[PDB]
Design a protein around this ligand. Sequence first.
Ligand SMILES: CC(C)C1=C[C@H]2C[C@]3(C=O)[C@@H]4CC[C@@H](C)[C@H]4C[C@@]2(C)[C@]13C(=O)O
Lengths: 142, 131
Amino acid sequence: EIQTPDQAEAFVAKVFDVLDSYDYTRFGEVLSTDLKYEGGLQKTSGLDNFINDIKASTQRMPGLQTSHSRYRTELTAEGTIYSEGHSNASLESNPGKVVTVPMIGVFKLDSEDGKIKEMRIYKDRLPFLALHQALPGMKANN
Amino acid sequence: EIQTPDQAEAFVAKVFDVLDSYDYTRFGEVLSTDLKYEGGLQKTSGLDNFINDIKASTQRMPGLQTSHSRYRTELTAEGTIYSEGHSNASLESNPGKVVTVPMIGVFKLDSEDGKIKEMRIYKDRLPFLAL
Ligand SMILES: CC(C)C1=C[C@H]2C[C@]3(C=O)[C@@H]4CC[C@@H](C)[C@H]4C[C@@]2(C)[C@]13C(=O)O
């Protein structure tokens, strides 16, 4: 059970380690099957609907690779985790180009099994339009 | 001064009412002179630099009209305000076309005067390309 900001931050890091793998068979390890997700105008109910929202993104961005870091997390008396950090993304065909923006995640956990029941992620997606398909092994950025 | 989350939420609403006026002569009513602001890739230190960055960012959006609403606010033991809500924008030339996105603001206050000394606003700006 998460009781300190550091434990909450470590759990957020574990969550994004799963999400950033795109191994959908592992998402239920950390996300409730009744997950309520919001990321901007993207809004889903249920883990399968969440996964189908992400798969569609990996098609807008072939070879998408992502990572997250954290620097400031609070765990509140209401049980909410607020975790501020950064979101990094590239396309595998040109890994020397990385887009990084600040982000914050708001999380609520299931009281029984500790999985994420509500996840609201806020960041600016406009800079990610700078990601672009390239030929792997062929220079694509000045 | 602020002691409850409902009071924190009312203050954030008042702050956005000032910001959404674009009347920079009033920004110091609620923002500290040494404001540290981040909004995605926008990042400023000092109230003068915040004003100048908003002024510059909006110069290519003549007729911009914005408003904000609040949904869910917490006030933590250490005084952080986390306020989730929505940001609405339209242009005076076409006021019926409104773009609304979720947002959250993270705020820390100056203990001496209760003004905002740190303000970090998170939201997706991509939908605003439609304006
Ligand atoms: C449309 C968008 C680019 C914007 C115009 C104005 C209004 C805005 C919208 O919420 C913000 C609300 C608070 C203040 C930082 C505003 C600055 C903008 C540049 C803002 C932003 O930085 O998001």
